[PDB]
Symmetry: C2
Subunit: 414 residues, 2 copies
Amino acid sequence: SKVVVPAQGKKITLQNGKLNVPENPIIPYIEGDGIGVDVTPAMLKVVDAAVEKAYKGERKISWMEIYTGEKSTQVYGQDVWLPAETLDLIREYRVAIKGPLTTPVGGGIRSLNVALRQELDLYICLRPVRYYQGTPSPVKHPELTDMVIFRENSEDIYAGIEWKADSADAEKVIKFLREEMGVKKIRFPEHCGIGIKPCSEEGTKRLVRAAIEYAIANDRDSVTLVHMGNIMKFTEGAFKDWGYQLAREEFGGELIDGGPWLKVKNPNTGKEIVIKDVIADAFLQQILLRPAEYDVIACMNLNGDYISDALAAQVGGIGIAPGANIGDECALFEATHGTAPKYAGQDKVNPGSIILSAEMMLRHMGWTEAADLIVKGMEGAINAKTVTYDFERLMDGAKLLKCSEFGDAIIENM
Amino acid sequence: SKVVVPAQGKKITLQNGKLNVPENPIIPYIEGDGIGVDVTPAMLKVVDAAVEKAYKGERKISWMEIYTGEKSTQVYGQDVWLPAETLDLIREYRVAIKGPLTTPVGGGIRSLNVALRQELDLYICLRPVRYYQGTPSPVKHPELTDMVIFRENSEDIYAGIEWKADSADAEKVIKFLREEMGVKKIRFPEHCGIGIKPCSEEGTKRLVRAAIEYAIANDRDSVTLVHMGNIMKFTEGAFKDWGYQLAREEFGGELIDGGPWLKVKNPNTGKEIVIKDVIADAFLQQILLRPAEYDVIACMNLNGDYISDALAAQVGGIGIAPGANIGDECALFEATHGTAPKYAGQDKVNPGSIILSAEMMLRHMGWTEAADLIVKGMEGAINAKTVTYDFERLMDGAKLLKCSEFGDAIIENM
């Protein structure tokens, strides 16, 4: 019911782990709640422009609206926050894009962002953060940050295995812990809440396999594994050891000096990719202090969340950091920010994060000329100092532009 | 066996939740491994100076060496990393100080820092981070950071309840989760590692009671509760709700506008302490971007670890951030950094973090004139630009001083 398939357009298809992409492809998009009604029109107008320019008129995306979040209840019953349908059309048309989603409070429904990521097994959350010349930054030297994050999306504490304090189930599990497993380290068991953090071999190796394979494809200098593993030996300490095992076994890694770090062969280039580890709290500090020593990061779901958001802040963008959730069978590109409902409908917020995730969506389909064009576009709009509220409270002599007008400034510069 | 009690000195005593502190008190100190052999001589020389000056000769600390870490095996059997004795002498003499401790790898022995913190129920880890005028910083505006962290120390994932992947126990607990509790959200159960994160009411309220009581004592503007609670409803989401319940019930909190944030009465001053919440990933960004809006932070063990280390980096100090572990019955002041064994014995490392934790130790005994004197001392040593390797690679026209020589520069300036 209510999604209308367009007339002209063909579905993308998978053949030999590679995508066959039509000249006229169907790409679904979820508009988003709150500021989604503003940034999703800017993204469609500028992607459309960037492929009319790049392929001088021969390719054209056919856009199809699908639903999640608040707009879905409007469209069906107030009861439904993620229609079973949406999950099928992201896997069928293989590549889709989304704006922001908030979830109802308390009321059973778990973060919709993670319902989608987990129900479609999008196990790689990829978050590249680089500096755009001319962005107001908090830090002194932000040009030294050019990092790419592979945050694991299927596991960690972020899975949602938790029981309410004084639940009949919470008491069921703490009794099992004290009686059957000999756990003395629980300080207060009466009125206590419990969560489970799982970490496995086949889940941490599929994420670090993609992170090393991406360093090889893009001629990157190092892969850092971050983990708070001196305290959590068997979940984060295990992920450090299992990621090293994999660079030894599937990628032929070899010892530097005498440890712990390894050296890996680029087959396409013969350069030497270093594989290292930093414990995550020291890493949080390492990213402000010695940022050029780090490049590709591989980490678990909660660590990757905090590191990404921190790195995005460092370089000047809570609001223009691109995102992708990727799996073997499909992919979803998303805006990374909140719904921000106070400033919604008014067209003043920044569309940068959703536009730069449409860039990431275009590089993945293999349309790199239209994507390099959307980044030529963003570097000029900003060099020319013409920008949105969030970059103008911060600087001198910038001209203030609305959200629909800033997309038109991206087209001007490509 | 081997700790020698000094001849002149009396033990500190507790009476009515307050300390009775002798003119000639006994304070134990654990030297530390690695750079501990260098920074612990600087701390003793400068504290001794700061009380000969302040009390013109009438008070004198009697220091007593107790043991943990590497030096303990030297002193007893190679088998013992934390002698049962040490735990008794910290609780008996009530206030003690430590240098850094590393733990043996793998080999059963859990992080010695947390064995001490957990076995002595030091449930408040207090970490104040402020900027010292003239420190090389990564960020543009570091003077805006003056924060104090109450990291909870008894719980969270940081407790150490974890089982090896493919352990007989790990399979015991995942079978209980799938069969008896109906857990479907575990992506890969074969070859999977598990950890438990507990969060309770009597544990989160004793930590937030201290954080509000400290804001009242020191005339602070706000108390922020950080939690990644939109994803972890029942451990971190529970700690947000339980900390609000406590400012309503024991401190008379009242609603601002209409939520969620509260307003609390200062009885000593009638000013208005705001109680707010930020979800932890956005907080990590909020600390770089709007740092003046935050003051006292209350958070769980893993969150408090990452936030502290990040805040310490922001302002210019991985290596001069003070620390205290506090409980109802005793307290331990510590250096926050690693053992750094490469640079050990050579006397080149910074002694700032252990000295500034001896400051914190002196304010707690109630000797505030000797403590204000140790901070007059550090602000001048740095204004005068005379400093250690770690602050000299970073700046212009500084004179290079060794570690024992930098303590002598702190005495000069008080």
